[PDB]
Design a protein around this ligand. Sequence first.
Ligand SMILES: COc1c(C)cc([C@@]2(c3cccc(-c4cncnc4)c3)N=C(C)C(N)=N2)cc1C
Length: 376
Amino acid sequence: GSFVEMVDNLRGKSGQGYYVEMTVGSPPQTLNILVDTGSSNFAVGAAPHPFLHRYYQRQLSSTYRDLRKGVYVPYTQGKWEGELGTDLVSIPHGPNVTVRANIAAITESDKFFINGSNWEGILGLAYAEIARPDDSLEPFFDSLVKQTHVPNLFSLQLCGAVGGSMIIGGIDHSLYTGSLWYTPIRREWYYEVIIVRVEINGQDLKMDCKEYNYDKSIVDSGTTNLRLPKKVFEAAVKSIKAASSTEKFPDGFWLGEQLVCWQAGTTPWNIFPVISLYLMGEVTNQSFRITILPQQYLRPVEDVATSQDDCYKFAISQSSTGTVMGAVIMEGFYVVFDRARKRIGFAVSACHVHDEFRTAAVEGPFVTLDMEDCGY
Ligand SMILES: COc1c(C)cc([C@@]2(c3cccc(-c4cncnc4)c3)N=C(C)C(N)=N2)cc1C
């Protein structure tokens, strides 16, 4: 269960998350589980569903323990419900350990599972504060750290086209180039961070930095898009439209309602600007930036029927729940969730995005003297 054996342990489909293989129960039942830094439950499909290839069968596990507690999770566009219990859990291409963990056996759901995603459950990697029904339900990673000698850290190397790596208990130096820059975890609930500055093709958006973090900024592998608060989304779209003015796209493209297509191999990457997110550093008024190319924010939509063309969805969207640095932001970066030191490291990954003109980057330090607190 070394780091080499953990390399390439993730798979996925574009816009459908990254998943890792796990086993639940005795004898082990193999399931594909979404790696989610934006939630804190280990929630697995435990009843038949038209989108599930397989599911957790509690009756077949001798080690299953029922907690006699239901869990009901409604949200805007859907819901999931289930029963809480505990069982033996392993990650075959992860640490060489078996732990007893809480499991939310999903019995009913609406618009939760995805057709052809190839995953059957979600591994919520965030803190107990956001666990459902409440903070007393110990998340998986907490159980793993308590029961084993595994260091309190994990890292994610999400690669586009999908695949990548989840390294538990350490940093795999073969997965990144250059320096690892750290941003403090503001509060241990979601992986909450602070954005101090936003530039679009080197041009500062010129907003009070609190606007970037209205009402929180999080690092979420379970969200596809870069999600931005209304004011920031509007200014970003205006700036991207201006840089890409040689071509006009429908309003629906800017809203995520429609694809933009070009003849295969002709995508005009150069008309689209680079987006720079400046993250709060580990020392006062110091920051570093992560640079996002259009190869990350224009997500390819694979469709045999549109295959004479290369088609893309605009992977930046409006949020009313704060900034979300989703999968398109994480892609090409090696992201260290250093729980032990309450910080998140970013470095250029071995699968980073680039063309012959520009590259995705992690650069610093940047100083500011006229800075307030950028948090809410
Ligand atoms: C606590 O209950 C939840 C909720 C409310 C949301 C998510 C989910 C979620 C749920 C179902 C599918 C996905 C999903 C879909 N497409 C791509 N990646 C992930 C995400 N939604 C977000 C924003 C997230 N980070 N995880 C997971 C769980 C377990």
